[PDB]
Amino acid sequence: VGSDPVILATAGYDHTVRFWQAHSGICTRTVQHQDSQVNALEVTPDRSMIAAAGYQHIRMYDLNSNNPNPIISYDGVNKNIASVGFHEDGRWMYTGGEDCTARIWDLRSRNLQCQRIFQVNAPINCVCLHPNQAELIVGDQSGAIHIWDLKTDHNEQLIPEPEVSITSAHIDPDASYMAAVNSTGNCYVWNLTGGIGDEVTQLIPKTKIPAHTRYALQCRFSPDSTLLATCSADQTCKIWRTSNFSLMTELSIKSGNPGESSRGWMWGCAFSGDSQYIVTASSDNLARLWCVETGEIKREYGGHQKAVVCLAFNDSV
Amino acid sequence: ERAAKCRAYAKALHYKELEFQKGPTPAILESLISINNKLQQPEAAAGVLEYAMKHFGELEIQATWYEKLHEWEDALVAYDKKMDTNKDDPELMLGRMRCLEALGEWGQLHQQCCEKWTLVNDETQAKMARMAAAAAWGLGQWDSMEEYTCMIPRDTHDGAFYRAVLALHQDLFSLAQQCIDKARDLLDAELTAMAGESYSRAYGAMVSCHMLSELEEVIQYKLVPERREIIRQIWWERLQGCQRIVEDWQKILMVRSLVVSPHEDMRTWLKYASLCGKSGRLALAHKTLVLLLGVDPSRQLDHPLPTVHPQVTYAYMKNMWKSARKIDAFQHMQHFVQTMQQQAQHAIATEDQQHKQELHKLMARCFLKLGEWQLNLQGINESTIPKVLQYYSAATEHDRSWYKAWHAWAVMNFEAVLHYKHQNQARDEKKKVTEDLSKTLLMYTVPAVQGFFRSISLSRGNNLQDTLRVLTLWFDYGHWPDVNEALVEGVKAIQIDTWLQVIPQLIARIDTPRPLVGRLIHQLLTDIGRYHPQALIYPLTVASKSTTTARHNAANKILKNMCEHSNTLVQQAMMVSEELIRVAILWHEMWHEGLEEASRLYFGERNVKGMFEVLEPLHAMMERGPQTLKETSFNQAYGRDLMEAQEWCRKYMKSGNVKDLTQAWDLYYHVFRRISKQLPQLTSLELQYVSPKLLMCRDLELAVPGTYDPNQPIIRIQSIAPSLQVITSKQRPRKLTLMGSNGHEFVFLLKGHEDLRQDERVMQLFGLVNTLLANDPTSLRKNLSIQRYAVIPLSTNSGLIGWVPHCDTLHALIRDYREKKKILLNIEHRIMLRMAPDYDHLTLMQKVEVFEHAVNNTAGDDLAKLLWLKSPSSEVWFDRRTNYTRSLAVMSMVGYILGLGDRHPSNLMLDRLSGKILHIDFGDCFEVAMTREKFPEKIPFRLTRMLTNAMEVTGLDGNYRITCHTVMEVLREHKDSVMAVLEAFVYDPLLNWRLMDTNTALNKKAIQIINRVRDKLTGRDFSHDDTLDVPTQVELLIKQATSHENLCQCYIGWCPFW
Ligand SMILES: CC(C)n1nc(-c2cc3cc(O)ccc3[nH]2)c2c(N)ncnc21
């Protein structure tokens, strides 16, 4: 199940974490995650085990032992845990919580405690790690984005438009671009002054995309740095050219008549390694696989009883 | 026939709206403002226009919008913009002109008419005539009037009207006589031509008919020299009385101008100018005063003002302050006063006493402004304090009476005390210090006290604030003889009446440890005892049964003093209250709560020392022996078990066993199971079992609770109804009903275990807010009021609440509708759980979806729909809605300042006869509900989806928001009275307990709450730094009260989807 070269994971309000075989739609294994909805899923760089950020815990089921239950649970934090992220070298894990803290966990040791804590006023929705492993980008509900230098412990903060909750941020693998998406449904793009190694690492504003009228729920860059994907409460995943920042492909699930009252938000996405395909999480209980170029619905992974809020997607050798 | 015409309309609006429900078209939008207008519902329709703007910028040209929004001043500058950018465009000019004729800008209206006379447009030629006739009428130029009248057709009411004026100037009264009777008939027939769907031309016909009847008196003023006082009286009275917006009075005066020049009217035009300043048309107000001065728009700006007419100058000076130039304004005042006192002291040759007096009274007003303005320009500090105090005392001198003068002086003195106290807390934050502090505070306290006393006497009927203030000083000043002397002088001086307003506050300090303070209180209360007892017994009775010795001691003393006096009243009231507290929680009910508590401490907490404290008062309670049949029936079936269950507990006390203790709980759980069974059986109480004494009571001298007030003959407890329905609830409250000595019956809620003393002061606040709303003319225009209750506390546990008729809880009305229409009551709830079983723990983002999901698959109607089906007609449906929208808004704002939380669907209700809404349960006050740990309210007041729905379509734009600012404006104006009351029970010694619940000294906590409140009353409630004006703050509140993010967070019971 971590032995298949393609790990595809789905989580939601239905107390399971389901694993799928990408190319078929067959659900492989399914895992018990009770007493909470899953907020975020992320497969560890090591491909050994997957993390499930939820209500006041991060349970972590194993991809190699192909069977058991959580190897590691992390506790002692109140209010939700919104984002997870790992540092390339095996042992570090980051989290944004409703408790207004970004936290760094030593995976290679004991303690329900965490190695570090970074307080903010206002809950943290998303946390991601600059590819250089040196800085952690933190977005909160006030509309502030914090760059946390993991060396200098210097915090530096940036608000775009906000008096508006920034919902997710992400940063292209090539470290050229950073993107923040907020509850207005805007998408901000910054250029990266690659300071690094004896660092500066500045951000130069490039564009605001009027991506959506409704909440924008997540944003993500293709591994290529070619494309920017934006998921939203308008039941849509919009894929943007990084050359143009114009709309390339729109994936959506909006009925076919004004009187259907929605059914489903586009909660998340993950690109494929070759950036050819995109996975989609939705409140209509499905994950979906799309052709990024045609916007074809190349598959529909059905199983969850209740809504789907997370994906994880892995293509490593 | 006339009452039957609006019925046709109301019932058409109902559908016209229900149509707009299905799809907002500019078509409907047009026929909605129209029909709402015939229905002479102007402000509701004005809401419709707001929606017109914020969706279709599509009768276009922002100047045409500013014109329909009667905002001529905005439309004029927007029409200039649109004329200079574009070309001539004959219609742009017409609008540009209408803006002038409403603004009374005759100078520009006449010029704009002549200067542009190509006007190849012939309709443009026709409309042109009417305006440029009145324009020339305001500019004297009668030739110009005649020319432009010779172009107005004699068929129009307007054509016939302006002929009447031209004749009356050129003295042709037989012509003028006939022109009026024709203009009447040309307007009579015109009011049936546009038989409803007209402008404020049905309201402005009353402007023309007024002018026509006045213009017939102008005829009377030419021929008969002996109505020159009769006519001027009716002219003058039908003015202070009359209320017609600025614009109409211009015209009305212009009629009177044909006969009396402004310099003979003066008071008339100063009164008019006065109004132009309050409504905020200063540029106009000015031009009136410049004429009355007959001296420059003080273009010679560095020069002194002319003292020729002291009254007119004073107007100008404040018009100056209200205008931009206000350091300048302040200057001219200092000097103007100096010129005035010299114009008195010398120029008063004896045989001129009236001039002297009016001159001293004008000065007192000047001195008040001087103090007022000085404060505004400088603030409060060591340099202003003496000056304004001097300014005010000076004002006191020249008027002696005058509430305002004596008030201002006291408040200044009282803020001097505050300024220094609050400075010294600053000093102590970082012996000769205290000795100068005490000399300081003593120096300003005594006059403060003194001031408030003379101010109170001059109010009488309207002084709650001042009265409360006297108390702050009285209680706060742990009594230094100086202050005590001044108080005891005052107490003697001022009427007893006064203190009734304040009885709860006084009794809150019955047991003041400070000796010099207590004495006076007791004395005062006993004198309040002498005249109007009744106003005293109930409140004293509560106190006389108080765990705290001091309280019930000193309470009894006053009652004793009242027996040498009204003994059998003290005696009756004594027993009626006792018995009602027995009836409130029956013996077994107390055992039922006391057994639950004791099992939580023992079996759930290992607390036997807490447990013993729970049961022993219930054991000692019965130790007295049964006294009513119900107490004996209980005693038989449970007494023996319980008395021996305590036996085993008291064997354990000494043996320290656990097998001794386990025999007791064996017996204890036995009776619990017995009682629990019989509890849902309690659905009625009969007096003859429960309290016999109360059944016996016939024709008492005691007054029916909360009915006593002077003015009104005393209504007494003539008999108590034999049965009490027990409303089945968590606190099974009884529905007690009394028979009145006037005939009519009086119903009450007899509550068991809720400290009703808070809700009491809350009523007090509402009382005041009602007075304020009655006194603001706009609020009075719209009948705006709060529903208050009669809250008669009985103990810390119990009390009586006045029963309001014709009401069902919001929850009820819905529960019924849903069951009638076959909808599952809690459907939004079930839907939400079906979607997300873990709803309570979702991220905000996640919740908002689940919430929206529920909302989108359920009817938003119900309340709107059930209120239509209820209605017996359609006009009755319509006015019940007008009443609803307004009453709901009033409490929205009031509730906000009060910080009134917990507004779930069972805590508010709707009077099914008037349509008005009413709130119950005022426990969760101040931010409390939002500060709590579990499930914190984010809502400022329930402005929920079915409440919105039930209003007019275009609701929040219409009557709701309008009524919002109005209420809020009244509140901010009277921010001090409102705060007097609030401080009164934040710092109330017996009520601070509701702020140590932030856990589940207080000095600092109480400070916050009040600051929080002031912030709300000054528009600082949001951004610390901004000072938001009303409509902004209002808009902000609605926004917040409406946000899905806020609502999806509400505790589910609150029903954020209702
Ligand atoms: C039983 C339901 C319908 N109900 N609750 C009340 C009620 C009003 C009320 C007012 C308070 O200040 C404190 C508690 C209260 N409880 C009421 C009332 N005052 N009059 C008529 N019905 C009423």
Side-chain angles (χ1 to χ4, degrees), chain B residues 204-333:
Chain B
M206 253 248 71
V207 173
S208 266
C209 93
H210 186 84
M211 276 166 77
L212 282 156
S213 42
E214 283 250 294
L215 201 61
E216 278 177 347
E217 295 161 67
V218 162
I219 272 173
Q220 290 179 45
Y221 211 118
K222 297 273 185 179
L223 289 137
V224 287
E226 195 225 315
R227 276 239 212 209
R228 279 157 159 151
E229 277 160 19
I230 307 172
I231 275 168
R232 278 175 181 167
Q233 274 164 7
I234 321 159
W235 279 14
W236 179 233
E237 283 143 42
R238 224 196 311 104
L239 208 82
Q240 296 142 305
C242 267
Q243 286 208 28
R244 320 198 171 205
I245 319 171
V246 217
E247 308 73 18
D248 301 289
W249 272 37
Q250 300 193 55
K251 321 209 151 202
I252 298 156
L253 284 164
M254 286 165 75
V255 168
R256 313 187 185 189
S257 299
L258 293 149
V259 149
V260 206
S261 63
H263 314 277
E264 299 167 50
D265 291 294
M266 292 245 168
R267 67 175 194 212
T268 320
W269 294 81
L270 284 170
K271 173 63 198 153
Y272 160 70
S274 154
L275 301 157
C276 316
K278 300 177 168 196
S279 75
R281 257 208 194 158
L282 299 175
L284 177 73
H286 191 253
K287 272 147 203 197
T288 326
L289 301 179
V290 177
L291 164 79
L292 280 156
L293 278 169
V295 196
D296 274 33
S298 311
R299 299 164 187 152
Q300 273 175 22
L301 218 102
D302 275 330
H303 289 270
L305 297 161
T307 311
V308 278
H309 317 287
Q311 215 60 209
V312 177
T313 313
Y314 178 84
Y316 196 92
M317 305 215 44
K318 45 197 290 167
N319 185 63
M320 177 147 52
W321 176 277
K322 289 171 192 185
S323 204
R325 281 250 130 207
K326 100 173 165 190
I327 299 160
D328 201 0
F330 184 65
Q331 255 298 328
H332 286 287
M333 194 64 90

Side-chain angles (χ1 to χ4, degrees), chain B residues 643-769:
Chain B
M643 195 150 58
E644 195 233 325
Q646 191 208 190
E647 178 62 35
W648 280 112
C649 274
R650 283 141 73 218
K651 283 174 195 169
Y652 162 89
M653 290 170 187
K654 66 102 173 186
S655 81
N657 212 125
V658 84
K659 265 69 223 65
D660 275 301
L661 200 57
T662 209
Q663 324 295 56
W665 272 113
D666 229 23
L667 276 154
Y668 275 129
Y669 269 94
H670 178 75
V671 303
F672 192 94
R673 284 153 209 165
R674 290 161 140 186
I675 296 155
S676 311
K677 283 176 203 167
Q678 282 182 348
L679 278 192
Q681 293 171 356
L682 278 192
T683 56
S684 181
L685 280 185
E686 248 192 328
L687 237 18
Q688 43 126 313
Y689 297 87
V690 182
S691 165
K693 304 217 180 181
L694 285 178
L695 188 40
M696 152 209 80
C697 306
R698 279 281 179 183
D699 295 290
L700 267 38
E701 67 182 55
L702 223 199
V704 177
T707 60
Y708 174 58
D709 82 299
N711 304 312
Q712 301 306 288
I714 288 197
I715 285 147
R716 32 259 320 193
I717 305 168
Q718 170 250 276
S719 103
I720 301 180
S723 310
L724 316 188
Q725 193 228 314
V726 159
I727 316 277
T728 21
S729 137
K730 180 62 194 178
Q731 285 111 195
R732 268 115 35 218
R734 296 89 169 89
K735 195 185 167 178
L736 160 76
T737 157
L738 321 187
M739 188 63 73
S741 69
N742 57 260
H744 314 326
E745 230 142 345
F746 292 88
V747 206
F748 296 79
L749 228 39
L750 184 61
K751 286 187 164 281
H753 6 236
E754 305 125 66
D755 175 62
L756 283 177
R757 291 170 301 158
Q758 305 183 35
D759 293 51
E760 199 207 11
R761 319 299 177 85
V762 174
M763 285 317 100
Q764 204 164 14
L765 165 61
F766 294 170
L768 164 45
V769 183

Side-chain angles (χ1 to χ4, degrees), chain B residues 130 149-163 179-191 193 201:
Chain B
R130 172 183 293 105
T149 314
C150 289
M151 307 227 73
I152 318 168
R154 289 149 204 189
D155 269 309
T156 330
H157 137 74
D158 306 66
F161 183 85
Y162 292 110
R163 264 101 191 174
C179 301
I180 294 159
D181 297 294
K182 278 148 200 159
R184 273 170 172 166
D185 305 348
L186 302 170
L187 198 57
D188 270 303
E190 172 68 347
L191 288 205
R201 206 205 155 167

Side-chain angles (χ1 to χ4, degrees), chain B residues 749 751 759 763 789 791 801-804 809 909 920-922:
Chain B
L749 228 39
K751 286 187 164 281
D759 293 51
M763 285 317 100
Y789 303 123
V791 182
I801 290 137
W803 180 271
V804 243
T809 92
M909 54 189 63
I920 65 166
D921 195 347
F922 302 89

Side-chain angles (χ1 to χ4, degrees), chain B residues 479-685:
Chain B
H479 272 295
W480 353 60
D482 281 22
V483 190
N484 206 79
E485 284 181 78
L487 284 160
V488 193
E489 259 303 281
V491 165
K492 291 184 197 172
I494 181 196
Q495 295 275 354
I496 7 73
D497 261 4
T498 312
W499 314 100
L500 303 186
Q501 290 175 330
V502 141
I503 303 207
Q505 277 67 228
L506 287 154
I507 286 168
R509 317 265 165 157
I510 279 193
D511 55 337
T512 315
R514 286 281 194 237
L516 219 48
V517 181
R519 254 165 271 175
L520 220 194
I521 281 165
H522 289 232
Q523 195 233 313
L524 176 56
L525 281 166
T526 316
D527 299 316
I528 302 166
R530 212 143 44 84
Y531 316 92
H532 16 259
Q534 212 95 57
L536 256 178
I537 353 135
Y538 288 114
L540 273 162
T541 307
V542 188
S544 80
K545 38 205 176 186
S546 181
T547 311
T548 141
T549 349
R551 297 206 56 88
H552 92 286
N553 261 319
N556 282 314
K557 276 99 192 178
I558 301 153
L559 286 155
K560 174 73 197 68
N561 267 299
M562 279 178 64
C563 280
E564 309 161 8
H565 164 35
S566 281
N567 177 85
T568 59
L569 214 210
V570 183
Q571 280 324 317
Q572 286 176 6
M574 206 67 69
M575 159 279 233
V576 167
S577 63
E578 284 156 34
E579 290 316 286
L580 287 162
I581 299 174
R582 175 211 313 281
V583 176
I585 333 164
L586 273 178
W587 261 15
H588 65 266
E589 307 183 321
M590 311 176 63
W591 276 110
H592 196 94
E593 67 185 330
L595 287 187
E596 281 183 47
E597 180 43 58
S599 100
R600 288 322 146 204
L601 288 167
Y602 187 64
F603 295 101
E605 282 216 338
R606 287 303 158 209
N607 191 3
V608 200
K609 282 186 184 175
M611 188 209 81
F612 277 147
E613 287 166 329
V614 179
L615 305 174
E616 73 175 328
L618 295 161
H619 287 285
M621 163 187 79
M622 294 176 56
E623 207 165 307
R624 295 152 198 156
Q627 312 143 62
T628 62
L629 291 173
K630 185 84 194 205
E631 273 179 40
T632 345
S633 93
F634 174 95
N635 206 18
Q636 242 104 55
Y638 307 89
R640 186 247 94 206
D641 312 3
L642 260 10
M643 195 150 58
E644 195 233 325
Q646 191 208 190
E647 178 62 35
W648 280 112
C649 274
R650 283 141 73 218
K651 283 174 195 169
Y652 162 89
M653 290 170 187
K654 66 102 173 186
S655 81
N657 212 125
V658 84
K659 265 69 223 65
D660 275 301
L661 200 57
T662 209
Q663 324 295 56
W665 272 113
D666 229 23
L667 276 154
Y668 275 129
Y669 269 94
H670 178 75
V671 303
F672 192 94
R673 284 153 209 165
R674 290 161 140 186
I675 296 155
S676 311
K677 283 176 203 167
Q678 282 182 348
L679 278 192
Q681 293 171 356
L682 278 192
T683 56
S684 181
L685 280 185

